[PDB]
């Protein structure tokens with residue numbers, strides 16, 4: 001008995017990520033809350049497998065766009081919420097310029113009250129002591145524009161954008177994202193528009209394990 | 225079909241798995257003699273020390289080598305599906321701990337019997353009996369209850385493995401098994417297993433001796 005109606009209030013979030021980069025395996029679990037009426041996430045991620053083989057920032061995009069704030073005049077362009085509760089599949093290919101690639105497949109859906117993002121990630125061809133495996137990325141995340149277009153053919157959407165990762169030496173590591181979402185059930189197909197993102201990364205001062213506290217604001221725009 | 229097991233047969237076993245995101249690969253080699261129901265295998269953990277105890281991997285490391293007494297040959301699904309082979313799927317629920325999901329192909333490649341497995345382990349406790357390595361290095365005797373699954377033209381199986389824990393308690397692991405051929409009346413397999421070491425092999429390893437015999441039909 002619902003739809004976008006599942007997001008009128010504060011929703012508990014659970015994220016799990018199975019990761020495989022250059023034969024190094026890891027697992028991340030995140031917990032927190034989202035509030036789509038204001039577009040806010042507040043999450044804590046733990047690398048349960050011990051210290052990560054890649055930098056935390058490289059995982060941020062891949063770790064619930066259903067918590068974007070879609071302004072009242074854009075509600076009919078909100079694919080992510082309309083797929084709920086059965087949810088959607090989110091697939092990406094992430095190209096790190098002059099370095100390796102991530103391929104991800106994710107199921108975002110309601111499991112009871114909770115919104116759950118379960119992810120498989122596989123990364124290949126990363127250079128040793130490149131920015132990623134060498135851990136040369138600053139513990140930062142930049143603002144971006146996620147460009148969304150409809151994919152009528154598969155009853156879903158496509159997304160394109162370039163993530164910018166600050167490197168320690170003052171340079172910038174680019175990560176080209178190509179994104180597909182399709183429904184798991186049986187949705188709104190949007191006119192072209194974008195998401196505007198902002199993200200803070202910090203730590204829990206009493207947490208011994210490798211981890212990431214994340215706060216994020218995202219609003220939809222580009223339609224008048 | 226059955227004719228492929230009237231003498232000593234070489235075995236190769238390969239397990240690609242990860243448990244709570246901890247990866248590991250295991251290779252096993254040796255022999256089975258299905259007329260007496262005997263397995264003799266050596267398993268190597270390439271990739272280093274295993275994140276889980278060797279005993280938890282036993283069941284999911286070739287039941288076609290069970291001894292099926294003459295009066296029960298009609299009920300041997302395992303052997304009949306050869307050389308084509310079969311697919312073995314399980315879910316193993318460790319009581320008060322995590323779960324394994326496994327998929328395996330058991331088939332003849334040339335003259336050798338091959339068991340190739342995939343394994344996902346989820347939701348294990350960090351200082352539970354598994355991830356904390358609190359299981360004794362041995363292995364109890366069991367009854368594997370087999371039934372017919374006409375719908376998938378194969379069999380199901382259920383049983384409960386008992387793992388001895390160092391403090392003297394018992395870690396139970398509930399097995400659920402499906403086999404499909406890429407059929408018998410109700411019966412069970414009687415198992416016994418000894419595990420040991422090879423003194424000249426450093427790599428985390430398991431040598432396994434095992435005798436299995438089918439019963440439950442007079």
Ligand code: NI
Nearest residue numbers: 018020242344
């Ligand atoms: Ni995997």
